[PDB]
């Protein structure tokens, strides 16, 4: 996608040499923002092939407030395995905060529903926010939220959304995060009878790994293909009743996939 | 400041007509980002006169974890009065979360100190974050955090910081928020023996009030003056030992102030 390749280039161009926690070197820039008009098309990167499958399951999984990888395993989705404990437990990660942020006073707050209420009964609110940064549980999480914070905005029957992503691997993860949230907004909107607006992506520490250079050049040499079109084949009674099959992407003709090993 | 006037213009140019909670109309855009190189100079808007005084006290006040306006009153600072209850109580706002975010398990987390530790013993971290968005206490706050979330970043002995501001009044508040955080980073940095990097400002719902149009045009017609220079006249033993007098701004020659009444 144009915006993506631009980021790629910029980090190549301005990234400074930081080392990641593993010791693997990065090329990082701090602070970036990019907008995607959802009506323009579904932002799935085409300059390299990407697989929605595991993206969809994960989203559905977050929405259930599940933190164990059982559901993912049932569908043979293993992106969380690397982190899970002996029982498939990840700790109070995403799903948990989204749906049951715990209060000191004994409550479990469901921010997803809160948000839905706001969108329906107060679209003009400046606080339609969902946060996964629960300071008290950080220590129990397998990993701290990367996309830790998001806000919705309504204007002219168009729902928009800004995500704050504190840490980013431009090559491996970005693409996936973009599609994931864009998917969320489509569902959200369907459920509120609003048309999709923009998806704004904001990053903190945005980087490329030193061992992803060729693949970067390689990808940087390709030309973006037209964006595909997401189709929701059905309208559930709630945001929690979506099924893997309600989604279907049409018009996606990406260039070949590109593998990027990682260190350990 | 150049970046500021640009924002101003843009909202004039692209803001769509949203109504605020009071019913006062706004011109709003969603999602904006702007960077200020702190070495370039202290970002206090010059195209209109601004008073640091109350900005400094407030910052010092947040750092103490105080939520009552007594300290502010001692110094005749009344920007919080509009919100305070019969006793000067604001609820678990900013100061409280920064210094004593409460856990469900009975702890009070001091994110300011946590952050300082990270900056000193792990500058490469991608999670040097402070959040004031405590979902559980939102309901007890006089108002929900506007600048709800910030992240620090270290690279080449330069500390940088990104603030996520969910809601913004470009005219009245922005200027003040910019100086406030920039001040924070200077102190933070002094305390860590780092040089100041950038201050990145990210907004969600960014707006101008309909009754601030003339003043906007008025301000938009001025030409930015050179940025002043902040001077910290001393180095305390801690981030909590700063005094109102340690600060001094030099070289500030702003154009005349501009008043902007507000509705109720």
UniProtKB/Swiss-Prot annotation, chains A, B:
Entry annotation: catalytic residues: 146
Compartments where located: Cytoplasm
Chief site of localization: cytoplasm
Coiled coil: none
Disulfide bridge map: none
Any single biological process term in GO: regulation of translation
GO MF: magnesium ion binding; protein homodimerization activity; RNA binding; thymidylate synthase activity
Enzyme class per UniProt: transferase
InterPro entries: Thymidate_synth/dCMP_Mease (IPR045097), Thymidate_synth/dCMP_Mease_dom (IPR023451), Thymidate_synth/dCMP_Mease_sf (IPR036926), Thymidylate_synthase (IPR000398), Thymidylate_synthase_AS (IPR020940)
Effect of residue 50 to Y: Shows 0.2% of wild-type catalytic activity, but substrate affinity is not affected
Keywords on record: Cytoplasm, Formylation, Methyltransferase, Nucleotide biosynthesis, Repressor, RNA-binding, Transferase, Translation regulation
Pathway in which the depicted protein is active: Pyrimidine metabolism; dTTP biosynthesis
Catalytic activity: dUMP + (6R)-5,10-methylene-5,6,7,8-tetrahydrofolate = 7,8-dihydrofolate + dTMP
Binding residues annotated for dUMP, in chain numbering: 21, 126-127, 166-169, 177, 207-209
EC code: 2.1.1.45
GO cellular component annotations of the record: cytosol
Residues annotated as binding (6R)-5,10-methylene-5,6,7,8-tetrahydrofolate: 51, 169, 263
Family matches, as Pfam families: Thymidylat_synt (PF00303)
Subunit structure as annotated in this protein's UniProt entry: Homodimer.
HAMAP family found in the cross-reference section: Thymidy_synth_bact
General function of this protein: Catalyzes the reductive methylation of 2'-deoxyuridine-5'-monophosphate (dUMP) to 2'-deoxythymidine-5'-monophosphate (dTMP) while utilizing 5,10-methylenetetrahydrofolate (mTHF) as the methyl donor and reductant in the reaction, yielding dihydrofolate (DHF) as a by-product. This enzymatic reaction provides an intracellular de novo source of dTMP, an essential precursor for DNA biosynthesis. This protein also binds to its mRNA thus repressing its own translation.
Similarity annotation: Belongs to the thymidylate synthase family. Bacterial-type ThyA subfamily.
Protein name stated in the entry: Thymidylate synthase
The gene coding this protein: thyA
